[PDB]
Structure 1
């Protein structure tokens, strides 16, 4: 997260770190046994780390659980990143409490101007790499479809939306991918891609979760 602030330990109880010996992507807990992340964060040997704040120190509240299976969306297109969503089932259910809680799936899509909270352990520099130890937060609004398409002509599908600041300076970045964009307490986006980080007129693009609720529910119900 570039230009964001320290969330404060466990104030984002649904945030998870996907770990394969280092933190590589974020995710969101949606029930005690499933996490939603982005398709391009897929890999084998994933350990989901819940209740984290400093990812380099065991401070207490952490729950480390192995993924039993990862389900990348069947129509995921690695070239366009269209349908960039993945569900991860945990080997055992997580013990939920105040520090580890799930976030709700939306019932409707959000409108432009909605203010949302984006978090993660991704890079904090737009020019260079500086990864933080604790979780960072950023409040950012959803942009209009016209501004998003004007910024990324030909690359935005109906399963994507832009959120951010066109002036640059504040944005999500590498390491944040797969994590949550929460608006009014509902998970509305998944950090997916963008041109650089915090560059002027190049906001972040997020997977539009409202378009996948039936798919998430049907898939969870059959697995």
Structure 2
């Protein structure tokens, strides 16, 4: 997260770190045994880390649970990033409390102008590289589809939206991938892609979660 703020320990209780020996992606806990992330975060040997603040220090509220299976969206295209969504099932159910909690799925899509909270342990620099150890947060508005498409001609599908600031300086970044965009207590987006980070006229592009609620629910119901 570039141009954001320190969230505070366990203030974003649905935020997960995906770990394969090191943090590589964020995710969102949607019930005691399922996490939603980006399909571009797919890999084998994922351990899900809940209750994290400093990802480099055991602080007392962590739950580390290995993934038993991952399900990439049936229509995920790695070249266009269309349908950039994946479900991850935990080997055992997480213990839910105030610091480790699921986030609600949307029942309808959010509108341009809605403020959302975007979070993760990704790069904090728009030019260099600096990875924070503690969770970072950014409040950002959803942008109009017209401004999104103008920013990224020929690349924005109906399963994507932009959020952030066309002036630059405030954005998600590498390492935030797969993490949450939460608007009025609902998971509306997943950190998906962008041109660099926090660049002028290049806002973050997010997976449009409301389009996937039917698939998420049916998938969970049978797996």
Q: Normalising by the residue count of structure 1, what TM-score does the alignment of the two structures yield?
A: 1.00
Q: Which residue of 1 aligns with 2:28?
A: 28
SS in 1 for 2:108: coil
Q: Which residue of 2 aligns with 1:17?
A: 17
Quick one: distance in 2 between partners of 1:109 and 1:75?
A: 20
Quick one: distance in 1 between partners of 2:75 and 2:188?
A: 20
Q: Which residue of 2 aligns with 1:5?
A: 5
SS in 2 for 1:111: coil
Quick one: distance in 1 between partners of 2:111 and 2:135?
A: 27
CA drift of 1:31 comes to 0.2
SS in 2 for 1:100: coil
Q: Which residue of 2 aligns with 1:58?
A: 58
Q: How many residues align?
A: 223
Quick one: distance in 2 between partners of 1:20 and 1:128?
A: 24
Quick one: distance in 1 between partners of 2:62 and 2:166?
A: 36
SS in 1 for 2:181: strand
CA drift of 1:162 comes to 0.1
CA drift of 1:153 comes to 0.5
Q: Deviations over 1:65-100 (max 9, x none)?
A: 000000000110000000000000000000000000
Quick one: distance in 1 between partners of 2:207 and 2:142?
A: 12
Alignment gaps of 5+ in structure 2:
none
Stretches of 4+ moved more than 3 A in 1? Answer: none
CA drift of 1:212 comes to 0.2
Q: Normalising by the residue count of structure 2, what TM-score does the alignment of the two structures yield?
A: 1.00
Alignment gaps of 5+ in structure 1:
none
CA RMSD of aligned residues (A): 0.3
CA drift of 1:145 comes to 0.5
CA drift of 1:128 comes to 1.3
